[PDB]
Amino acid sequence: GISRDNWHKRRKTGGKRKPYHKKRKYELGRPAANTKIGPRRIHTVRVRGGNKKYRALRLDVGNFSWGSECCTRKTRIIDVVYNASNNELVRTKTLVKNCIVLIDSTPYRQWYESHYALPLGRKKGAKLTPEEEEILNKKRSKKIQKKYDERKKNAKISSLLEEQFQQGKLLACIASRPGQCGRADGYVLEGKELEFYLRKIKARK
Amino acid sequence: MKLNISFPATGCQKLIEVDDERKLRTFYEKRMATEVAADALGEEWKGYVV
Amino acid sequence: ARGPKKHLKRVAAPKHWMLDKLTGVFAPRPSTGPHKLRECLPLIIFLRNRLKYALTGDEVKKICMQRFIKIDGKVRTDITYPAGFMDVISIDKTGENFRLIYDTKGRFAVHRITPEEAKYKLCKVRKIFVGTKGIPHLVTHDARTIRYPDPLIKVNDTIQIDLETGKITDFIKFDTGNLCMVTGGANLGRIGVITNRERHPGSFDVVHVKDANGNSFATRLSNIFVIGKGNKPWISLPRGKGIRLTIAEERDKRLAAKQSSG
Amino acid sequence: ADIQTERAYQKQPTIFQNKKRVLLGETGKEKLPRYYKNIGLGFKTPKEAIEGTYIDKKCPFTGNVSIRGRILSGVVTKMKMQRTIVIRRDYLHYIRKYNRFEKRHKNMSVHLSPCFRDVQIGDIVTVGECRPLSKTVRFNVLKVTKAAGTK
RNA sequence: AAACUGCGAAUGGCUCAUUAAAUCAGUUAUGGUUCCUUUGGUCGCUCGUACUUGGAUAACUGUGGUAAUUCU
RNA sequence: UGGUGACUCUAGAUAACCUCGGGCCGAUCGCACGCCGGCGGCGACGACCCAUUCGAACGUCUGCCCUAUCAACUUUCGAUGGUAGUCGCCGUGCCUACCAUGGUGACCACGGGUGACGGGGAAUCAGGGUUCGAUUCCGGAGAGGGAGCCUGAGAAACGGCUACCACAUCCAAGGAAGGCAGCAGGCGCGCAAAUU
RNA sequence: CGCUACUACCGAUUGGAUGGUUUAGUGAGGCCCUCGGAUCGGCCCCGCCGGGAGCGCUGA
């Protein structure tokens, strides 16, 4: 029976407002969708006009975009690490819009290696499992190898992104409203936005 | 307590007025959609599962 | 209050229907359709109050369910179907075609047209928009969606529509010097040549129209409907040619006609 | 100054700022394009909005508001809110029985963009009507004209 | 006839208790939204048993319970 | 591509996603005629999307009676604004978290009173005005008082449901059933208003 | 000053009725969420030749 009406509020002058009508159906509100990280659970809501809203109650997968490389991937949502609105929303690990999440980087790592030899970090270490060295070296005709060689020119990943890829988790921002559309979609944090949010997360501790 | 007993195979039905508590003892504390051997209702009822 | 209303009081009806005040409490509530509630002539008003083929609404229903009436070439059995400006009403049984047109008093006159002119109509395009993989669509004043219009056709232009196929035959641009009629406001029903359109960005444009008798008036841009290229209308006009008379001139004409007639 | 004075990163949603960089194209700073639009009705975009760094989603020129409806005017009387100012619209109301007028006024809370520096009490502001921006704000300052006494 | 399905039942009618920039009136806006119905349009634009698929349930028949209901 | 005064519009391209409570891409129905293992003309109904037909909901501007024996009010429990979000059909302190200390007022705020629903309008009126407007048209509100919902495009619906409060009906005392400010008609109230 | 009547205030006693605001609890009922899983289904193992049994899995 919660309501979003303006007539229960005080006036700009500050005086009380006496209601002339009781609560209307079109003025209703609904309980918040405190979308938690977990196996996909989405409840549909019949809304005004006969349309539907997708109240996502549990999500562990989101379509996040690496915008510098124009690479949108479906990824596992691992953690919630920063919320600008409420710090309770990070303790409870609630997925809302503009909340900062830790997502997986493995599909971004696959697209990373498909444009082979993005910035060299630790690639000469005591590691190299079989069956994926082909995606890095391969037997390529001279034209395709030259194409990869010229792709090497645009192999520039920010140092912070490199540390995140080493950690296996990318910082990302959820640009969707999980409690309204049923998806937790967003974009990988990079640039001054990434620096700002890293500073904020560090200063929270 | 009366018993409205039906036989689906011939689609027949009959109402039996049962007054003795001993016969109905086997029905008490049993929920709906439960199989019970209704041999306590008489000799002709022996072997019937309702 | 809750949901749409379904009735229309007799006195709250549009005044151009020329309904009575003692013939019931209710007026025919026009159905939803191509034209607005207050800018339409319901089929019952046309077939009963104007043409007098029916004395009651039941007789209008009897006439309409025999499929004798066609609006824009399509048989309509809804006796409250909203018929509005430029609509062609054809009765093949009695073999007559009318075009719903405005009189200088702002009322839908009973304007008979030839079978050859009943094959088409004029529509003011209300919007043009590119949609659905790049196809230009054009919406008209009668809610007729036409795909692939001529790229020259813009908003406020007039298009001649062939009623059988619903496709554009020709078009008149909205421009100074073009004949037009007024479809709303005080000057409703008047016909004249556009002389000047003065633009008000963020507000309503005002168009000035000069009569064929020299009289000049103004309307809002939404109330203009281009009728012909230059001063020749593309459609037949009522007994009056869009020239609104003053009350003195109308009184003199009436007196002279009665003197010379009986 | 530093526009990141909030708990969330402040940015124009239209502008994509972390495009892939180039070492030779680096000249000390990454460079940032500015999103601005011209509101209609012949109002010029201030040089501040085009070449500023402030983030204000309710700015008519760099935000997400549209100017539609009434264009009004008033004199600035309060500047004690964040990006909002209280202007006073004065008028005369006609009382017919006495064939006379009475001075009336009302105060409008209007959004003021950071693109308008050096706005003072008593300055005249042309404001444009937009969607509800807050509980009481429905107008956005489009132009500022200085008071004659300013020096 | 019934019964299932579909639509309507949110209109109309009554009353004036509440309600003091509230309702309301004129004026504008939705470039900040929803829209059954009518009308016009879209409706092989998916590139991997169809010569027609499945299970129910009403109505109906039959057995009933309650003092009592448009109960079942 | 197209458009507006103005889009973060329309259209286009790319990389993905595509809700078990899953989005469309007809397993529907009547009439009439035909020439080798095939076609087909009129309709009815239904589904998606667009177009606002009909609205609804929210905003803008200006206008409302008496009262100061009501002069300061609002701000803890949002009061004014900012940022992020939640919710909603959407804009919005609508709500939440954080932040700022704002916002209204003798141009009468705030409070109180009203045998105050508002207006079109009515009576009176030389001119100006005074009083009335429950009442058939438009808009609002309510269905004994509150509150919460289902269904649905649309209701916080009451000749729908669910409670409590008041009143009240039948009962075999276990239970069941209510809502005339609809049309008539009773009671009551009154100076005061008609046919079951 | 007497002195029948009439209207109005302040009141010890809060003597009785009708109302509306509020602290503190308590709180029906619906809605939402997290559980629950009566019961009903098919998929799992067989005959008869037409050619009624399990928190095994799954859906309501």
UniProtKB/Swiss-Prot annotation, chain A:
A lipid is attached at G1 (N-myristoyl glycine). Residues 7-25 have a biased composition (Basic residues). Keywords: Acetylation, Cytoplasm, Isopeptide bond, Lipoprotein, Membrane, Myristate, Nucleus, Phosphoprotein, Ribonucleoprotein, Ribosomal protein, Ubl conjugation. The keyword Ribonucleoprotein applies. InterPro entries: Ribosomal_eS8, Ribosomal_eS8_CS, Ribosomal_protein_eS8_euk, Ribosomal_Se8/biogenesis_NSA2. Signal peptide: none annotated. The keyword DNA damage does not apply. It comes from the Eukaryota. GO terms for biological process: cytoplasmic translation; maturation of SSU-rRNA from tricistronic rRNA transcript (SSU-rRNA, 5.8S rRNA, LSU-rRNA); ribosomal small subunit biogenesis; translation. Pfam families: Ribosomal_S8e. Coiled coil: none annotated. Residues 1-26 are annotated as: Disordered. There is a cross-link at K169, K192 (Glycyl lysine isopeptide (Lys-Gly) (interchain with G-Cter in SUMO2)). The modification Phosphoserine is found at S159. The modification Phosphothreonine is found at T129. The modification N6-acetyllysine is found at K36, K127. GO terms for molecular function: RNA binding; structural constituent of ribosome. CDD domains: Ribosomal_S8e_like. NCBIfam families: eS8 (TIGR00307). Component of the small ribosomal subunit. The ribosome is a large ribonucleoprotein complex responsible for the synthesis of proteins in the cell. Part of the small subunit (SSU) processome, first precursor of the small eukaryotic ribosomal subunit. During the assembly of the SSU processome in the nucleolus, many ribosome biogenesis factors, an RNA chaperone and ribosomal proteins associate with the nascent pre-rRNA and work in concert to generate RNA folding, modifications, rearrangements and cleavage as well as targeted degradation of pre-ribosomal RNA by the RNA exosome. This is Small ribosomal subunit protein eS8. It comes from Homo sapiens (Human). The lineage of its organism: Eukaryota, Metazoa, Chordata, Craniata, Vertebrata.
From Swiss-Prot, chain B:
It is found in: Cytoplasm; Nucleus, Nucleolus. There is a cross-link at K14 (Glycyl lysine isopeptide (Lys-Gly) (interchain with G-Cter in SUMO2)). Ribosomal protein S6 is the major substrate of protein kinases in eukaryote ribosomes. The phosphorylation is stimulated by growth factors, tumor promoting agents, and mitogens. It is dephosphorylated at growth arrest. The modification ADP-ribosyl glutamic acid is found at E35. Component of the 40S small ribosomal subunit. Plays an important role in controlling cell growth and proliferation through the selective translation of particular classes of mRNA. Part of the small subunit (SSU) processome, first precursor of the small eukaryotic ribosomal subunit. Belongs to the eukaryotic ribosomal protein eS6 family. Component of the small ribosomal subunit. Part of the small subunit (SSU) processome, composed of more than 70 proteins and the RNA chaperone small nucleolar RNA (snoRNA) U3. This is Small ribosomal subunit protein eS6. The chain holds residues 1 to 50 of 249 of the full protein.
From Swiss-Prot, chain C:
GO terms for cellular component: cytoplasmic ribonucleoprotein granule; cytosol; cytosolic ribosome; cytosolic small ribosomal subunit; extracellular exosome; focal adhesion; membrane; nucleolus. InterPro entries: KOW, Rib_uL2_dom2, Ribosomal_eS4, Ribosomal_eS4_C, Ribosomal_eS4_central_region, Ribosomal_eS4_central_sf, Ribosomal_eS4_KOW, Ribosomal_eS4_N. Its main location: cytoplasm. GO terms for biological process: cytoplasmic translation; positive regulation of cell population proliferation; positive regulation of translation; ribosomal small subunit biogenesis; translation. The keyword DNA repair does not apply. Residues 41-103 form the S4 RNA-binding domain. It is found in: Cytoplasm; Nucleus, Nucleolus. There is a cross-link at K229 (Glycyl lysine isopeptide (Lys-Gly) (interchain with G-Cter in SUMO2)). Pfam families: 40S_S4_C (PF16121), KOW (PF00467), Ribosomal_S4e (PF00900), RS4NT (PF08071). The modification N6-acetyllysine is found at K232. Coiled coil: none annotated. Keywords: Acetylation, Cytoplasm, Isopeptide bond, Nucleus, Ribonucleoprotein, Ribosomal protein, RNA-binding, rRNA-binding, Ubl conjugation. One of its GO terms (molecular function) is RNA binding. Component of the small ribosomal subunit. Part of the small subunit (SSU) processome, composed of more than 70 proteins and the RNA chaperone small nucleolar RNA (snoRNA) U3. Identified in a IGF2BP1-dependent mRNP granule complex containing untranslated mRNAs. Belongs to the eukaryotic ribosomal protein eS4 family. This is Small ribosomal subunit protein eS4, X isoform. It comes from Homo sapiens. The gene is RPS4X.
Swiss-Prot record, chain D:
The modification N6-acetyllysine is found at K37, K44, K57. This is Small ribosomal subunit protein uS17. NCBIfam families: PRK08572.1, uS17_arch. The modification Omega-N-methylarginine is found at R68. One of its GO terms (cellular component) is focal adhesion. Keywords: Acetylation, Citrullination, Cytoplasm, Lipoprotein, Methylation, Nucleus, Palmitate, Phosphoprotein, Ribonucleoprotein, Ribosomal protein, RNA-binding, rRNA-binding. The gene is RPS11. It comes from the Eukaryota. Signal peptide: none annotated. The modification N-acetylalanine is found at A1. The modification Phosphoserine is found at S66, S109. The lineage of its organism: Eukaryota, Metazoa, Chordata, Craniata, Vertebrata. One of its GO terms (molecular function) is rRNA binding. It comes from Homo sapiens (Human). Changing C59S: Abolishes S-acylation. Pfam families: Ribosomal_S17 (PF00366), Ribosomal_S17_N (PF16205). PANTHER family: 40S RIBOSOMAL PROTEIN S11 FAMILY MEMBER, SMALL RIBOSOMAL SUBUNIT PROTEIN US17. Citrullinated by PADI4. Its main location: cytoplasm. Component of the small ribosomal subunit. Part of the small subunit (SSU) processome, composed of more than 70 proteins and the RNA chaperone small nucleolar RNA (snoRNA) U3. CDD domains: Ribosomal_uS17 (cd00364). It is found in: Cytoplasm; Nucleus, Nucleolus. Coiled coil: none annotated.
